[PDB]
Amino acid sequence: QERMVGELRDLSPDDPQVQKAAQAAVASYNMGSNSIYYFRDTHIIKAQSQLVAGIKYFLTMEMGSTDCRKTVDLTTCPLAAGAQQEKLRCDFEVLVVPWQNSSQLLKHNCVQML
């Protein structure tokens, strides 16, 4: 066949390739979001991969708003507390291809947590 569609498989949330895919998702989400502040990953809850012509990562993760405003090393950005605190739970689909340096966030659906 012409198409390459591999098996969908569970990965460890601590797989270094999941982690890189996760930082790709965060960076892209922050670029596209209307929020004043950068969000930052707090927990990878679930991770799956699928071999295509390239690799898809399907990530479920939680994010927290930071004190860092956009107007980047997120490890230096504290999670906001009290009035500015906001938590999201997101599904991300990330595309990784060996000929591109930047991994792409194909889809995302985020949801504000109480």
Residue numbers in the entry: 6 to 76, 83 to 125
What does the paper say about this structure?
The cysteine protease legumain can develop asparaginyl endopeptidase (AEP) and carboxypeptidase (ACP) activities in a pH- and context-dependent manner.
The crystal structure of hCE revealed the typical five-stranded antiparallel β-sheet wrapped around a central α-helix. Two disulfide bridges additionally stabilize the structure by clamping strands β4 and β5 and the hCE-specific appending structure that is inserted between strands β3 and β4. Parts of the appendix structure (Thr76–His82) were flexible in the electron density map.
